[PDB]
Design a protein around this nucleic acid. Structure first.
Lengths: 149, 222
RNA sequence: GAAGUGUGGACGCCAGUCUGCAUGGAGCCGGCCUUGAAAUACCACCCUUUAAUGUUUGAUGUUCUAACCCGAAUCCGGGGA
């Protein structure tokens, strides 16, 4: 039963992964639950059309984002206050969720996934340069100012 | 190694023509003396069956007469008849050891039917070189005295081994492009005419050229 | 497809030739062409050995995640392949 796995494959598989699975089992589970779609000339022409349309419609949100972020370097700093006292250090740390919620309160809609933060760097009170990941190909950075509270 | 640039020579996939085969047979000498180029081919026959075997002679392009060194193997009084005959080398089955040993200095070998089975056992060495005595070749017969005398009349016998392959010296290594191709065509023509009636399918699955050691060259019999 | 000769060089370890070089005597293509201690030519087999590189498959270890498990009314949280 050649079907197109769209859900679970590698995080996502809404591209075109045709695989022969169990017959009857897929028509009772995979399909009803919305996880895969049969691989039939009209359909392949319809779904593969989404691929072209995806790259065709694509960049307005990226081009506008980059230009929007470039404008931030004109507005500057994003002050964030947190408890501190350990000789410059804080008692805690500003995680990704705190950044996304703080940076958004500034005037930009950014998720936590877009906040590239390998390790909690925000531990001291001062000026830091956080890195962001708008896309696997597009990156950026923001200047944050940790204030002593 | 001694094969590094020898491989750049021919194209294992390409099947060169005869003229090109000899022209390409060239490009492949720069060694020592002059290797007697032979012709190896895979016949589509059944080695086991006798009616399938292929043996004969072909008048290729030198080396006949008093010069030819004859080696006779007989038994009993036949030994004396061979001596008085004029055979340079004479002896019984005992001389089969010195041959098995090394001693190869001899152009042709004649023998009697009574010692053919023991000589046949040691035919693996003389077989390919076409030195093994055979009836049709008029090499084996009671009147050995007449055989050796008749010798020096002028044939490059050919036979297919157990593997089903048959080869024979077309001449030497280089040789003017014209001369070799001239002999290759002759050998092929003599082989096709030797194809057994019962043999079905493609007789010559693949023709080529061979002797001692060298790169590879496939050719078209046509 | 310049190298070979006779007296000169190298990247993993040991020798015949080969290439863009440089040159002479050793001869022109050679080297080639019958010495006990110094010896010969063109398409497949067998140990094929050893070494290096690339690809595929299997097993083990480590890390990351959409599974899965638990807490919560929910959001969500903890854990975690």
């Amino acid at each position: 039963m050649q079907v197109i796995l769209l859900d679970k494959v590698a995080n996502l598989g809404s591209l075109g992964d045709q695989v022969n699975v169990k017959a009857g089992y897929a028509r009772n589970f995979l399909v009803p639950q919305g996880k895969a779609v049969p691989a039939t000339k009209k359909n392949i022409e319809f779904f593969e059309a989404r691929r072209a349309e995806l790259e065709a419609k694509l960049a307005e949100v990226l081009a506008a984002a980059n230009a929007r972020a470039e404008k931030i370097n004109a507005l500057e700093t994003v002050t964030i206050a947190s408890k501190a006292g350990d000789e410059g250090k804080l008692f805690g740390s500003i995680g990704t969720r705190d950044i996304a919620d703080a940076v958004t309160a500034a005037g930009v809609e950014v998720a936590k996934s877009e906040v590239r933060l390998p390790n909690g760097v925000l531990r001291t009170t001062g000026e830091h340069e956080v890195s962001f990941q708008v896309h696997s190909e597009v990156f950026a950075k923001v200047i944050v100012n940790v204030v002593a509270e | 190694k001694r094969m590094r640039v020898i491989r750049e020579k021919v194209d294992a996939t390409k099947q060169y023509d005869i003229n090109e085969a000899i022209a390409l047979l060239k490009e492949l000498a720069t060694a020592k003396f002059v290797e007697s180029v032979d012709v190896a081919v895979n016949l589509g026959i059944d080695a086991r069956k006798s009616d399938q075997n292929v043996r004969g002679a072909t008048v290729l392009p030198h080396g006949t007469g008093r010069s030819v060194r004859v080696a006779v193997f007989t038994q009993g009084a036949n030994a004396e008849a061979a001596k008085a005959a004029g055979a340079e080398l004479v002896g019984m089955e005992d001389l089969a050891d010195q041959i098995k040993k090394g001693e190869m200095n001899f152009d042709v070998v004649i023998a009697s039917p009574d010692a053919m089975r023991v000589v046949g056992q040691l035919g693996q060495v003389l077989g390919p070189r076409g030195l093994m005595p055979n009836p049709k070749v008029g090499t084996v017969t009671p009147n050995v005295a007449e055989a050796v005398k008749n010798a020096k009349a002028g044939q490059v016998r050919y036979r297919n081994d157990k593997n089903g392959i048959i080869h024979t010296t077309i001449g030497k290594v280089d040789f003017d492009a014209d001369k070799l191709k001239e002999n290759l065509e002759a050998l092929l023509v003599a082989l096709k005419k030797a194809k057994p009636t019962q043999a079905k399918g493609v007789y010559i699955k693949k023709v080529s050229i061979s002797t001692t050691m060298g790169a590879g060259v496939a050719v078209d019999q046509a």
